[PDB]
Design a binder for these strands. Structure first.
Lengths: 245, 42, 177, 140, 41, 355, 354
RNA sequence: AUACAGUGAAACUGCGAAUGGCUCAUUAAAUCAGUUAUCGUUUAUUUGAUAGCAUGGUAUAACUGUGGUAAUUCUAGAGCUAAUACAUGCUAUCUCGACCCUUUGGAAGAGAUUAUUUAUUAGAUUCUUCGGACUCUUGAUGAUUCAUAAUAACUUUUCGAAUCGCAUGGCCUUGUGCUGGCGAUGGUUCAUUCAAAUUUCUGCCCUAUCAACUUUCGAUGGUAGGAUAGUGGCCUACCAUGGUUUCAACGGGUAACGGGGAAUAAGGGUUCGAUUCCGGAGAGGGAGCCUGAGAAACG
């Protein structure tokens, strides 16, 4: 590898996109964007193989440049923009909104959504720091920075944020026994309450969680995305509610 | 040491580099040697 | 070019390796900007990314600071008096970090006269300075220590040696001469 | 010895002003390495300068913490340790007596002899062969 | 060639500069009020 | 004339005892135009980092060579300026010249002179025609425009206020830097008239929240034995302004304190001349005014030094009668009501000597 | 293209346009924002030393930043080619009549070998070499090094028979005479030694001397004259002695210039006389007739020098220094312009009618 | 449409050509496979935050002509003309607010008002009007001399819009006064995004008819210095002699590039491993070198 690689062969494409195998030999690579490289989902695949509103790449391109698609209140225009976990998509001529989320097997899937819930979104408070002029800021998972954050915010939090204006609505700590979402891991995607939190001093800080079918399992703070309290999830989950039969 | 030791080690390329050369002596070295004798020593 | 890795060296179990792949751009070695006293000569090198590394090869002026009082000024240079790298380098007057030098004292003398009114040599509580440094003032010739890396910034910024380390390097100078 | 070499050995950026006549004329900075590990008094109040010192040197321990036994002590500020362990032989379905030698930087604060049981940790590589810095000794 | 649109661009540039300055000042003032009230409480 | 190597060329040839240092006759003949070129090089505005770098370079340049060169430089500055309006009059000006360009010249002069003071803290002398006349002329113009124009010219009034503040602070700095180098009786009348015009009229109502250059200058006036000339020239107008500041209870303790170290210094300093007795009786009235203070308005160092003031008052005994002894017992009960944990055993023993 | 002296005509055919106190780099920026003989007679940063090849057609130069060697040719009147090396060379020499083999003492305590095919492998030296010379009757690279050692290596043998002894701290200047194949080494400690090959024995040790200001000298030149018989030494006070082959009495004595050290003293086989050339870091170069020891000319290059060379025929003086351009000088009074620059007769006519 | 405006040749400028593709000859911890570090570092672009003079200069390509030569992806000579070309440069806020006022506050006044290099700091570890009062002792990790915040200077040296589309308004001293829409391009830092760079732990073919080894020229480290993006016997200046070991080092044998996969007797496990996946390495000889965020490219 001389330098950067700007392709992705079809087979080695992220297996959680569930592309059909015998269509061709190349895969669509998301561009640089607000989410990571193995764990994003591009508008191209979301329109060609989830909404099925498309038959051809050029058709997806045509819709995109006619600009019916705006992401998080912002019009995107490429075929490679990498939408990420727990994300917002809006289509006007349908009055459709999509909360992009996970399923039981860990794939992405849609969540049909209306405006009153589209209007808010939740960044995982991940890196708090301060810089020039000693100004404070916080860094959410989506690569979004928020300067002048609430001093009541610490690491590993979940903050509900307005999209149009951009000012914080509220937030949520990391507290034991709360409805949370596990991002990675073998058994990711389930939702339960964190009974407690094991700590390793700068190491893997494992966490035990009971699920609503009342079963214990183990996750890590890297994979846990805090959702909310008991009986109060703050985002309309797709059906399944973490129950796996 | 690192490279600060003088050992009379064999260097092939310079051993066969450019030698031999001429005896570019414009005298017979006999008058030269007795001239050394007749230098500021005497 | 000047390599950087270590696979060219032997192993730790008494063995010699072979060639793995050729020299690449990300293991570059470059020339030391061995600076001598002279007209300020700075060269610009655009390096990896958008970096601009300046290397100086002749320098006569640098920034040096007095510590106890806590001042700092631009000043000339007489030239290197010691550098633990090589005494031959000191003789040849090669400027390098962690070296000992002789530097002018008239700027600090002018500063002291302007700020104090008491001329050094020949507010007394704040005007008291070390005997060696005031003798250096009277001679007009002071000492200093340079610790700026030459071939990284082309800058010569250092401090005037205070009592303990000044006497330390002075006894070193006397042990030399 | 306090000037063990031809340069003014000192930890950088520490300045003790001669203007103030503090009783402690030698300021010694250190750091609590933590990680569940204690900082010896000899280190925090020694009179030595060491940049590779795990507790006073400007390098941090991190990553992997490993155990061994001292073998050779003919070498300044660095001691090699021995690890013995079991091997994975499939043909005869057995273990095997295995040994490895790991040189590790040692700080002058600690006292070491051959046969001691010591623990070390990972730091940024310093020399061609050394990779680690000790954190504790222990009598054996 | 100087144009009415160039004049408009100049006034717009100054307007956006002062606008973001004002917005930054308002955000700072609101954060200060919030911090003072929470520290008192 | 070059720019990109200006500080290099300066620090190489133009410094004395350096390479190609200028000889005596050579400088005698070439410095005038050198003065003009450095006048330009200081007229350059430092609205950037490199520009302020070369400005600090040139201000470090000036205190090197010799003084009469700088003196002629300041003379040229004043020649660009003028004071002959005021001083063909006394405090009048026939053609009131308050143009923005004129005040810009004023301000540039203020900048250069304060920079020269900062870089030549002690060794600077005071060339009278270039230090006394122009500064008082500038502040006089500031007051003239302040009282004549309305608020309409916001730019003009703002820079007039800034010029006045800078003139006050630079006069204070030069006074505290000279100390008593030479008698300034040439224009003590004019400068003290300028002092008594706005200050004693409105010294307490405005300058009471944070310390003022005027306050510290009056502190230096009390401190230096030769600076009582204003106090003994006017009927203690400055003393009454200080009394008004003390009486005003909206003044902060870190402003009132320095007033009290100044009072301690002026009490301690004796002068066997006229009005010194009236001055010390005015400070007795100041003690009467400070009787309720130190605990409703006023801080360990401050309380300690005011206690020392009371002690020194006790020993030297400039106040003796039964009225001031009743006031002294009132102050004693107030200060013994005050705390003692943050005090020193010696300070408590000095309380014991007061008792 | 200028002329400094009034009685004698010289020519800065190459050199700085402005004399002093103004940066050459700033000058070129300004003026190129606003006539050369050999294009890119230039390193544009500095220069160490020039040795014209014995063919009379090559110009080898050492350039400092990005240390390298410039290879000019006179047939093309430009750079034949450049070649980078590791460090800025201290001493170099072309072994052959052509530059096919060149060897240079490199300040990294080492020796390197340029060849027509490439750059043969570097070799270290135990002590910092100070002056390397090739004995040409017996194929020897021998260097007076840091301290008491004069290392030696043969081009047939390749070992070190013996590093000869110089009982001083440094080896200030070395020359070899081939008219009489002797070894000369002068040392700042005011000590000059002469060594004999075929016997491996020093034969002379002398030159204890003091100046008017009573300071030990700094002998930066220890060479001889065209006869290979009488020698010359030159030191810091503008002080040049010229001894004969076997006398302690200075045949010629002069002091001139300043405390700045004279850098090179060179003989000249003038048509009717012998001339002598000094280059000194007083930024000066002077011309004498040796027999009178009289200053026929004096020249101010307006930028100081690190090394000088003269064309074997006449007229040309290469000068390699710290300057942006290394520069050459023409003398009409000793001979015309060389064949390849024959038109500089016309250039001289142009300046004279100018 | 009397500046131009549609269309669009050429040419200037921007971006990109380091992907993809092919080849297997090499190599027995060399990479590799797994894991970790980055408190050891650089990052075009995407993405988020982020900044207090009515407008100027020259110098040219594409153009036109004249040429020359046997001659190219020949040039000369001469005459033109643009920049997101090149090189230059201009434009009021915040603290205490006495005093007036009670509302809502003003109100003189005393005050502060991008980057480089070094130095010095901070960043430590009880009474009750039982209705109610406090009337006492930054984040970060496991930690950084971190982030930050400042002082002073320091710099052959940074930008802090001399552009640009579509429309075309708002007010009114109807001036063409003064404001103002949607959006492209640029530019600072950080963040983030793709990588990259080193590196922890383990795991290699046959082999003693190979027991001894490196220790020079580094073979082990220390000190110190140069070296880039960064530590480093990376290199070097001074000290010491470390270090592999039959626990086979060391070398030697592999028409074996590595991993996965495939076939394989019913059962031990044996054969291709050429396939369509992911790594590694590479294309007359060599070296020097040029750009660029990215290279020893095949330019």
């Amino acid at each position: 590898a001389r330098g950067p690689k700007k392709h992705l062969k079809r087979l080695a494409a992220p297996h959680h996109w569930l592309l059909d195998k015998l269509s061709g030999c190349y895969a669509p690579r998301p561009s640089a964007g607000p989410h990571k490289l193995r764990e994003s989902l591009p508008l191209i695949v979301f329109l060609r193989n989830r909404l099925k509103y498309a038959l051809n790449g050029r058709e997806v391109k045509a819709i995109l440049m006619q600009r019916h698609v705006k992401v998080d209140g912002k019009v995107r225009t490429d075929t490679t923009y990498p939408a990420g976990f727990m994300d917002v998509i809006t289509l006007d001529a349908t009055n459709e909104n999509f909360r992009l989320v996970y399923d039981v097997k860990g794939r992405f899937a849609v969540h049909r959504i209306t405006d009153e819930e589209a209007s808010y979104k939740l960044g995982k408070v991940k890196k708090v720091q301060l810089g020039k002029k000693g100004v404070p800021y916080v860094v959410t998972h989506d690569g979004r920075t928020i300067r002048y954050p609430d001093p009541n915010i610490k690491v590993n939090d979940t903050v509900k944020i307005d999209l149009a204006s951009g000012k914080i609505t509220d937030f949520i700590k990391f507290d034991a026994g709360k409805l949370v979402y596990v991002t990675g891991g073998r058994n990711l995607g389930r939702i339960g309450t964190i009974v407690h939190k094991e700590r390793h001093d700068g190491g893997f800080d494992l966490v035990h969680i009971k699920d609503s079918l009342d079963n214990t399992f183990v996750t890590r703070l890297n994979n846990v995305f805090v959702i909310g309290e008991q009986g109060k999830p703050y985002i309309s989950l797709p059906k399944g509610k973490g129950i796996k039969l | 040491s690192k490279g600060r030791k003088l050992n009379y080690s064999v260097q092939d390329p310079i051993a066969n580099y450019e030698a031999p050369i001429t005896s570019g002596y414009k005298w017979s070295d006999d008058q030269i040697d007795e001239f050394f004798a007749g230098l500021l020593g005497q | 070019g000047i390599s950087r890795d270590s696979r060219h060296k032997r192993s730790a179990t008494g063995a010699k390796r072979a060639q793995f792949r050729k020299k690449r751009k990300f293991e570059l070695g470059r020339q030391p900007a061995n600076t001598k006293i002279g007209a300020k000569r700075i060269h610009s090198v655009r390096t990896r990314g958008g970096n601009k590394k300046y290397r100086a090869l002749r320098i006569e002026t640098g920034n040096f600071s007095w510590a106890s009082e806590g001042i700092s000024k631009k000043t000339r240079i007489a030239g290197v008096v010691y550098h633990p790298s090589n005494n031959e380098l000191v003789r040849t007057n090669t400027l390098t970090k962690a070296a000992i030098v002789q530097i002018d004292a008239t700027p600090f003398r002018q500063w002291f006269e302007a700020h104090y009114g008491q001329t050094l040599g020949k507010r007394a509580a704040s005007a008291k300075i070390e005997s060696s440094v005031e003798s250096q003032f009277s001679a007009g010739r002071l000492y200093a220590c340079i610790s700026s890396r030459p071939g990284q910034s082309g800058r010569c910024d250092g401090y005037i040696l205070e009592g303990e380390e000044l006497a330390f390097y002075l006894r070193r100078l006397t042990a030399k001469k | 010895t306090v000037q063990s070499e031809r340069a003014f050995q000192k930890q950088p950026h520490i300045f003790n002003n001669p203007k103030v006549k503090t009783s402690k004329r030698t300021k010694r900075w250190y750091k609590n390495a933590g990680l569940g590990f204690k900082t010896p008094k000899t280190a925090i109040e020694g009179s030595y300068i060491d940049k590779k010192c795990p507790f006073t040197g400007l390098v941090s321990i991190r990553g992997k913490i490993l155990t061994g036994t001292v073998v050779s002590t003919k070498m300044h500020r660095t001691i090699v340790i021995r690890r013995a362990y079991l091997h994975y032989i499939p043909k005869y379905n057995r273990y095997e007596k295995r040994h490895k030698n790991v040189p590790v930087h040692v700080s002058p604060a600690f006292r070491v002899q051959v046969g001691d049981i010591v623990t070390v940790g990972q730091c940024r590589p310093i020399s061609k062969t050394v990779r680690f810095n000790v954190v504790k000794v222990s009598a054996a | 060639l100087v144009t009415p649109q160039r004049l408009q661009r100049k006034r717009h540039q100054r307007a956006l500069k002062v606008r973001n300055a004002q917005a930054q000042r308002e955000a700072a003032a609101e954060y200060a009020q919030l911090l003072a009230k929470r520290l008192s409480e | 004339l070059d720019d990109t190597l200006f500080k290099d060329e300066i620090t190489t040839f133009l410094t004395e005892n350096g390479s190609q240092s200028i000889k005596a006759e050579d400088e005698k003949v070439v410095m005038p135009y050198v003065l003009r070129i450095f006048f330009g090089r200081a007229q350059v505005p430092p609205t950037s980092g490199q520009k302020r770098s070369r400005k600090i370079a040139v201000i470090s340049v000036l205190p090197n060579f010799k003084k009469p060169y700088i003196n002629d430089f300041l003379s040229l500055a004043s020649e660009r300026l003028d004071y002959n309006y005021f001083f063909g009059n006394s405090h009048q000006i026939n053609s009131s010249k308050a143009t923005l360009k004129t005040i810009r010249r004023m301000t540039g002069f203020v900048n250069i002179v304060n920079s020269t003071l900062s870089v030549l803290r002690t060794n600077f002398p005071l060339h009278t025609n270039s230090v006394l006349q122009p500064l008082i002329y500038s502040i006089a113009m500031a007051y003239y425009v302040l009282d004549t124009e309305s608020t309409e010219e916001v730019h003009l009034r703002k820079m007039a206020s800034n010029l006045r503040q800078q003139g006050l602070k630079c006069l204070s700095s030069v006074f505290e830097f000279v100390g008593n180098t030479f008698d300034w009786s040439t224009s003590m009348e004019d400068i003290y008239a300028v002092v008594v015009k706005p200050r004693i009229s409105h010294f307490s109502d405005e300058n009471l929240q944070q310390p003022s250059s005027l306050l510290r200058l009056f502190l230096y006036w009390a401190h230096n034995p030769s600076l009582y000339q204003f106090l003994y020239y006017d009927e203690f107008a400055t003393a009454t302004a200080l009394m008004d500041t003390i009486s005003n209870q909206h003044v902060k303790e870190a402003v009132i304190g320095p007033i009290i170290e100044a009072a301690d210094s002026i009490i301690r300093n004796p002068v066997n001349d006229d009005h010194y007795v009236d001055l010390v009786t005015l400070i007795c009235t100041s003690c009467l005014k400070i009787l309720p203070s130190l605990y409703v308005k006023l801080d360990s160092n401050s309380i300690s030094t005011f206690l020392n003031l009371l002690v020194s008052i006790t020993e030297m005994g400039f106040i003796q009668d039964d009225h001031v002894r009743s006031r002294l017992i009132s102050s004693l009960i107030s200060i013994l009501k005050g705390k003692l944990k943050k005090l020193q055993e010696n300070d408590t023993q000095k309380i014991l000597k007061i008792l | 293209k200028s002329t400094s002296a009034n009685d004698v005509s010289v020519y800065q055919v190459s050199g700085t346009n402005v004399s002093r106190s103004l940066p050459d780099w700033i000058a070129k920026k300004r003026k190129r924002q606003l006539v050369e003989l050999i294009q890119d007679f230039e390193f544009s940063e500095a220069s160490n030393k020039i040795k014209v090849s014995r063919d009379g057609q090559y110009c080898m130069a050492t350039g400092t930043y990005k240390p390298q060697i410039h290879v000019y040719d006179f047939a093309n009147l430009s750079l034949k080619f450049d070649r980078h090396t590791d460090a800025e060379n201290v001493d170099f020499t072309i072994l052959s009549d052509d530059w096919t083999k060149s060897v240079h003492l490199q300040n990294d305590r080492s020796i390197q070998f340029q060849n027509k095919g490439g750059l043969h492998y570097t070799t270290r030296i135990p002590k910092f070499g100070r002056s390397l010379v090739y004995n040409k009757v017996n194929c020897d690279l021998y260097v007076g090094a840091s301290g008491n050692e004069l290392y030696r290596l043969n081009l047939e043998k390749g070992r070190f028979l013996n590093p000869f002894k110089l009982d001083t701290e440094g080896v200030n200047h070395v020359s070899i005479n081939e008219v009489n194949g002797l070894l000369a080494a002068g040392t700042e400690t005011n000590v000059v030694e002469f060594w004999d090959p075929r016997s491996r024995s020093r034969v002379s040790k002398l030159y204890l001397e003091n100046n008017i200001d009573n300071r030990p000298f700094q002998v930066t030149t220890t060479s001889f004259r065209n006869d290979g018989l009488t020698f010359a030494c030159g030191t810091s006070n503008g002080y040049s002695y010229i001894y004969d082959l076997r006398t302690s009495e200075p045949s010629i004595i002069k002091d001139q210039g300043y405390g700045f050290d004279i850098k090179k003293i060179i003989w000249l086989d003038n048509v009717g006389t012998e001339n002598k050339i000094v280059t000194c870091d007083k930024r000066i170069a002077k011309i004498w007739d040796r027999l009178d020891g009289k200053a026929y000319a004096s020249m101010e290059p307006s930028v100081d020098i690190n090394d000088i060379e003269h064309v074997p025929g006449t007229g040309m003086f290469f000068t390699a220094n710290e300057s942006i351009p290394m520069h050459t000088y023409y003398i009409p009074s000793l001979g015309p312009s060389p064949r390849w620059c024959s038109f500089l007769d016309s250039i001289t006519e142009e300046l004279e009618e100018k």
